[PDB]
Amino acid sequence: VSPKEILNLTSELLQKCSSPAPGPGKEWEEYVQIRTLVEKIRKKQKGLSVTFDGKREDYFPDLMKWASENGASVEGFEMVNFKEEGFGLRATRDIKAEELFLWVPRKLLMTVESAKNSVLGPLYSQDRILQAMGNIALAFHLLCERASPNSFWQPYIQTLPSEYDTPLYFEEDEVRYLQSTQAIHDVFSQYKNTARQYAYFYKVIQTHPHANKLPLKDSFTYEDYRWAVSSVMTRQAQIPTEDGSRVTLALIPLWDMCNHTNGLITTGYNLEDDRCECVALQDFRAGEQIYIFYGTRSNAEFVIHSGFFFDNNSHDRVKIKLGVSKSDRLYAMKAEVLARAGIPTSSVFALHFTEPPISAQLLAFLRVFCMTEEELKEHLLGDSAIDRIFTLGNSEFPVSWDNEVKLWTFLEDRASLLLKTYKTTIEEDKSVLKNHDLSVRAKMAIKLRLGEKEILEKAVKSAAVNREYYRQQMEEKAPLPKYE
Amino acid sequence: TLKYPIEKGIVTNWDDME
Ligand SMILES: Nc1ncnc2c1ncn2[C@@H]1O[C@H](CSCC[C@H](N)C(=O)O)[C@@H](O)[C@H]1O
């Protein structure tokens, strides 16, 4: 209730969220403690500082008029509230593939550069965090303009969602589904970053004289900051500056109403006309939702940064950490072969769900990881050594039949070991999804943990098929393919 | 292709201490 009480609570939140990492076995405990302090602050505040009287669809007409007055495309589509994705664009005429149907001039964008020239500018010029991280700078730009009734971007801000499905909005028990996964550490980090940043900037805005003119000084709630960073992370894009020599982060009105489907990037920046341009990803008949391809992200990144889980994401993947051990008697040769191949001795690789399960770099690493001393020598010495290194990432040219049997054996065993570190099985997750009635957010968490295991299980199965294939080649003593 | 391809919701680093 009291301004002094909020100051004390934010000071405590700042100290808590600035402490070092407690160790992976204590990150859940720290997460709940941070949540407890955040929810105590949030329940003593009044939600979003600025709210609007109308419904969301009441403001899209003004968004169109504003965009039209500044040279954007406003014909051929309409805004529709779709159940699956929320609001999106629907075609009102047939749109052919590769047709330029959407363009947005730079003047409509909210950018780090427009953040500098705004009321936030003076604080930006002094505070080191804002200068180093344009995404946070974008979030405060968005909040400041939201709190400014005469802002040029009011038609855009009034049509933004009021809530998101980033993990910042999850209940404790919805995040608890993610325990023992790879994704949950990033959920922890996002919550700790956001809480730290809110507390830091709350204290800055209240005392730093360069924030004297900020509209946020009257009211700056945790809900404000959660909304602003979720708005930015689910919608921001990278574009070039007007000159084209640097890049910057931006919010792109109208275009950012398109929801996601599998495909290719069809949005580019036109520097000569200074506008964002989007060509149709596929044919869209009148009455069909207009989709774009957001980018080649994993489902962990879609959930955590984009606020949704995407079924049949063809680019999904999980991390796998591998390294040559310094206690290997062949460490020095293996490290040198990898170095000549441009591969580190230790790294985090990816496993993919689509074919093939492992990339050229991971294949090259696994081959060297399993090489005998005589194979390593042939990759280090003589007039063919460079040629041998060049084909290390190529599935068609193995080092030896036994080298392939060994690396696929190791991978099968490693992916099976990783599968055993999860708190549930694939069969159990599928039963929960079938026999429990769940919120959207809980389903996102369960499908994310299920998706991790399904990638691991498919790597297990593909490695076993590869192992048995190359074992047959070894038994038959078949001739090794040679590159020419 | 695209000289300046635009990725919607591009992943950025929010760790102000890193
Ligand atoms: N294929 C998809 N499935 C589910 N939600 C999706 C989606 N593509 C986009 N979204 C949603 O749209 C957001 C990106 S901005 C796109 C417009 C948004 N639906 C709105 O109402 O403003 C994501 O955070 C997610 O909430």
Residue numbers in the entry:
A (entry chain A): 19 to 502
B (entry chain Y): 66 to 83
Pull text from the paper.
Here we elucidate the structural and molecular determinant(s) of target specificity of histidine vs. lysine in the active site of SETD3. On the substrate-binding surface, the residues are diverse, reflecting the fact that the three enzymes act on three very distinct substrates—the large subunit of Rubisco by LSMT, RelA subunit of nuclear factor NFκB by SETD6, and actin by SETD3—with limited sequence similarity immediately surrounding the methylation target. To facilitate the methyl transfer reaction, SETD3 provides a local environment that promotes deprotonation of the target nitrogen N3 of histidine (and concomitant protonation of N1). Most (if not all) SAM-dependent MTases use the classic SN2 reaction mechanism, which requires the target nitrogen be in a deprotonated state.
